[PDB]
A paper describes a structure:
The Mex67:Mtr2 complex (TAP:p15 or NXF1:NXT1 in metazoans) is the principal mRNA export factor in Saccharomyces cerevisiae. Mex67 and TAP/NXF1 are modular proteins that contain four structural domains: an N-terminal RNA recognition motif (RRM), a leucine rich repeat (LRR) domain, a nuclear transport factor 2-like domain (NTF2L) and an ubiquitin-associated domain (UBA). Mtr2/p15/NXT1 is a 15∼20 kDa protein that also has an NTF2-like fold and binds to the NTF2L domain of Mex67 (2,3). In yeast, the Mex67:Mtr2 complex is thought to mediate the export of bulk mRNA through direct interactions with both the mRNA cargo and nuclear pore proteins that contain characteristic phenylalanine-glycine repeating sequence motifs (FG-nucleoporins or ‘FG-nups’).
Although extensive trials failed to yield crystals of full-length Mex67:Mtr2, diffraction quality crystals were obtained for a construct in which the UBA domain had been deleted (Mex67ΔUBA:Mtr2). These crystals had P21 symmetry and diffracted to 3.3 Å resolution using synchrotron radiation. Although it had previously been unclear whether S. cerevisiae Mex67 contained an RRM domain because the N-terminal region is ∼100 residues shorter when compared to metazoan homologues, the crystal structure clearly shows that a RRM domain is present, even though the sequence similarity is low (14% sequence identity over 70 residues when structurally aligned to H. sapiens NXF1RRM using the DaliLite server). Strikingly, all four copies of the Mex67ΔUBA:Mtr2 complex in the asymmetric unit showed a conserved spatial arrangement of the LRR domain relative to the NTF2L domain. A dense network of interactions was observed between the region linking the LRR and NTF2L domains (the LRR-NTF2L linker) and specific regions of Mtr2. However, in the present crystal structure, an additional interface was observed that was formed by regions outside the NTF2-like core and which buried 1208 Å2 between Mex67 and Mtr2. In contrast to the defined spatial orientation of the LRR domain and the NTF2L:Mtr2 region, the position taken up by the RRM domain relative to the LRR domain appeared to be dictated primarily by lattice contacts and so, although a spatial arrangement between the RRM domain and the LRR domain was observed in the NXF1RRM-LRR:CTE-B RNA structure, this appears to have been primarily a result of the RRM and LRR domains being bound to the structured CTE-B RNA. The electrostatic potential calculations of Mex67ΔUBA:Mtr2 indicated that one side of the molecule was more positively charged than the other.
Residue numbers in the entry:
A (entry chain C): 8 to 121, 134 to 184
B (entry chain L): 8 to 119, 135 to 184
C (entry chain K): 101 to 138, 143 to 412, 428 to 477
D (entry chain B): 101 to 138, 145 to 412, 437 to 477
E (entry chain A), F (entry chain J): 23 to 93
Write the structure that this text describes.
Amino acid sequence: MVMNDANQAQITATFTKKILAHLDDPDSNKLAQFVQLFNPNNCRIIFNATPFAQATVFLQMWQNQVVQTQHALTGVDYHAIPGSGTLICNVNCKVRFDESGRDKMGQDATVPIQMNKPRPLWGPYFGISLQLIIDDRIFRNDFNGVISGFNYNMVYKPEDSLLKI
Amino acid sequence: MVMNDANQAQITATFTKKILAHLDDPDSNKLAQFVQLFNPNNCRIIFNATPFAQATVFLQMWQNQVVQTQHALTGVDYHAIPGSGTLICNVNCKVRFDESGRDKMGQDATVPNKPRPLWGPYFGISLQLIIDDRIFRNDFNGVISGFNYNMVYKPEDSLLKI
Amino acid sequence: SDTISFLRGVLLKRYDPQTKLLNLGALHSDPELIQKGVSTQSKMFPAMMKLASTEKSLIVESVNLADNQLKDISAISTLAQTFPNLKNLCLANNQIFRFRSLEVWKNKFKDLRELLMTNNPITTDKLYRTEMLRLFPKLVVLDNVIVRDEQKLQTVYSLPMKIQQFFFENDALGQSSTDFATNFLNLWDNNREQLLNLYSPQSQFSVSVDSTIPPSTVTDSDQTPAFGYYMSSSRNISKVSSEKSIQQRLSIGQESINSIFKTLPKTKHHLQEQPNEYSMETISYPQINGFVITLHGFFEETGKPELEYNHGYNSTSNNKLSKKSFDRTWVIVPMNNSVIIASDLLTVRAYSTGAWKT
Amino acid sequence: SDTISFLRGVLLKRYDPQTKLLNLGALHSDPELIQKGVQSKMFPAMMKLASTEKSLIVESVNLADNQLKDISAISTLAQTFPNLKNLCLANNQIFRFRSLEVWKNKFKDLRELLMTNNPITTDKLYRTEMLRLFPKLVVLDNVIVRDEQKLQTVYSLPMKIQQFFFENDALGQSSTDFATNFLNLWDNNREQLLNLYSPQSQFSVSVDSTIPPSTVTDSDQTPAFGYYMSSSRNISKVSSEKSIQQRLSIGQESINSIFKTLPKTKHHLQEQPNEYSMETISYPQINGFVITLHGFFEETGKPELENNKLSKKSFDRTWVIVPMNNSVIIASDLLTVRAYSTGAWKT
Amino acid sequence: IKISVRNWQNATMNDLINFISRNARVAVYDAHVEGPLVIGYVNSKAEAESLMKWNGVRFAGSNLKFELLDD
Amino acid sequence: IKISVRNWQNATMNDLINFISRNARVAVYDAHVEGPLVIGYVNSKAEAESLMKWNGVRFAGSNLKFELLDD
Ligand SMILES: [Zn+2]
Ligand SMILES: [Zn+2]
Ligand SMILES: [Zn+2]
Ligand SMILES: [Zn+2]
Ligand SMILES: [Zn+2]
Ligand SMILES: [Zn+2]
Ligand SMILES: [Zn+2]
């Protein structure tokens, strides 16, 4: 029989928001914990139709080769699939990039010819569609290795953005 | 052996007040210090029965997706537990939210000099804290192990929907 | 008494259940109303509003008042009293030009999303948008143009999570917390003594009184609480200025814990009967190899305590038995067959409906 | 009409296609221009024609020695060649900072700038200002002022976006077939699709009211979700707890009801393959797979049952399908409807 | 409303004005020579567009061309 | 003629009616409980205004509120 519960829905929404917040976190130390959400043995990650075999590699790429971001959840819907022991979530959200010219470390690209960190300047909004395949165990407040499927793709881009995909 | 000391009580109470003050502070700069209070390795956070594994995400969500707040301490009691190396605090307080419709940045939801916040009606809060005894020795780095924050009563006329 | 029955009919005719819309536009045009009524044009509006309110089984999220030939809101000002959670409203084709009247609706219709003032003169005013945005906090669309982003508006007036009554890390702690809670409370109600087996010589217990009175807007709040029996034992560091007492108010060992247990009123907790009236949280406590159980709820005051000012004291009001709301936190250490309470922290406060209620 | 042909001639003569360079330097020296007699009003006209001609693609411009005291006369350049990479303003009389302020956040792709012999070069704040005004500036006065490597890495993602991802080519073929067939049937006759749904299979629709930024090419700033709002299952927007429970449809019957509740549409997938993006992944837990398809569709007809304006829409649809060798069954179908906007994968 | 005419050279101004007033059903009241191209003002825009229709008409061994101050 | 009374709680109806009959020297002959507020009928309007005079009076730990119901 099919599972339909408002509690589960709120859990899903807030968890999704938590995932996006986790993405938005620039500090490199805590990264190790983020990886805890993804299944270590078998996980399927996709970013702009480019795959990632292991969550570690994907988050390393995110931490190293991507500027600080700010996500904003616009929409989320989910279907809990009986017998699968899992649920699938169709998510839509907005994204802002730190277009300061500074990496997560805060290092500028300016060649030098010369403790309060400066604030990032947020660029135009990007459109994102994120598909999540998660274990139902999150309904039992268990989040260890629950994310099996992660499909993140850009649906529309603003031209005036300094970011080039 | 069990500790019962007035000095420790004053430290505890004032620290609680400091935590609430930290919560109420909208300035983004100071946030960096706030995260210092929580243990990075192992921490248990709860907000309206919704868990948080690590303090950073919680504090980011608090900074971004919650409006400026004003806490008013109504009650505090604490037990220093021997052998645990920790103390547990049962706290109760009232809360007012900025119902101006502006976030901590002061950004409106309207489509087109610092502004004053419009305080909504009071909310009831029960807060349980697990802290290290080290605060009695003037150490506040990673002292917060337990943070259980829940609303006990809400005013109907508030525009905030929990 | 006879007249009202007709108006009831007219409303039912003007209400659509599927669209949840009440079409109160152009009453002067309705032929049914002209033969029966009009020099009484002023007395019909509020009467109809009251009659709309009294009759259940009609839920309105949208109301149309286009073309009612109103120069002023007065005749319909009472609408705010009838459908305070109204989401859509149309006042088009009317002769309203001034803002003074609308001031009646400030801090009312807080859930209003759309407003249509298309053919009303006020549309000319420069401060129109600003004033309207002032008057209706959650307004998204005004005259069919978007004046507020639903996204931000939603994020601002809501927390990241909808409140839930229960949180358990793992199901074991859930079952354990439930069992412990129900049993402990039943014993706490009927026989305080039995609980003493759960406290060690190092175990501690204290009570903190929150004298604070909740806002009147809070549903079913106790605006005049009475903490007579508790105030003597209160260990509230913020409130009680006496520093010497606070040391004493803490009870260690089964003896002092029992003494304070006898000092407190005799109660009854309906955990099994009224489960919706309680919220609980349970988390791991690694430093003690145990758990923390926090319970928020209410309890009824059945009997005066087993145990027991300068100018004026009255036992009748201050010591009146009444239901109280409470926050109790047990720090517990598990053993194979048994459990030991490392710490028990109670908060007693005026009764108030749970924030977790829906 | 008379002047423009001549100026057009001068431009065409002064443009080189191979180097993609427009040499508007030293116009006063050109005998053709002096022959006529020419003076301030000429630049913007030339710019207007430069935009109008469209047979000139410019990555470099020379404006050396035009006796310009201020950028004002040539400001329109920013409107004409916004994607300009190289600019030379040497041997000119520019001395104050006011003029260049028009060009902040413009010429975002400007790499080289030459202000040689211009007085501003003396000022201490020169470097700072130039670096501020032109975000991606690499070379300024023939010296490197920004590291290209870092600059490139920062303002771009590790991977170029791709329109398609398939685990296996076979999954590609199958997914394409499924998409085309399902969508054609979805367009022309809604009922038949019910053959693909089991009694436990579920379908719901979620409306994303978000309006794309105006800067997005061909975005619909005024969307209309009249017909969808009634069936929308957006947990983020709709706070109502019971409705969300109700919005979900299980079984071919209720699925048919919602299929009837939605407007009649048409997907030009085969006609315009570049306007769609698709991803297909394995779903081991159900021994099936997931197809996520992002695109757009036109609204041909009002819903068969009972803001409300018909308009082109963008969509994100996700099918969880479990293969059965004879035919396939959709375990789950998740649709998202949003305002039209060109694909980010587009070029 | 400012009218310019070129390729009238080798022929007289008055004849040109009358010729235009004949063919184009529009008259220019005050016309200035100004070197190679004739300048004139017409009362209304309708006459200006009507006048602009007669562009490239053969006149005195060449084809006249008409233009306006602002495109 | 139709009388409604609120804030009569903490005392019995009989006490309320007798209290009114004592102090205001006017009686409601048939008085119905009807949930939170007491309903009764008094013979005349004069008795109703006279009864309405006794509005801010203290009664059983509270202050009575009287109303003449149009319903
Ligand atoms: Zn986390
Ligand atoms: Zn009329
Ligand atoms: Zn209307
Ligand atoms: Zn020169
Ligand atoms: Zn040059
Ligand atoms: Zn078409
Ligand atoms: Zn009655």
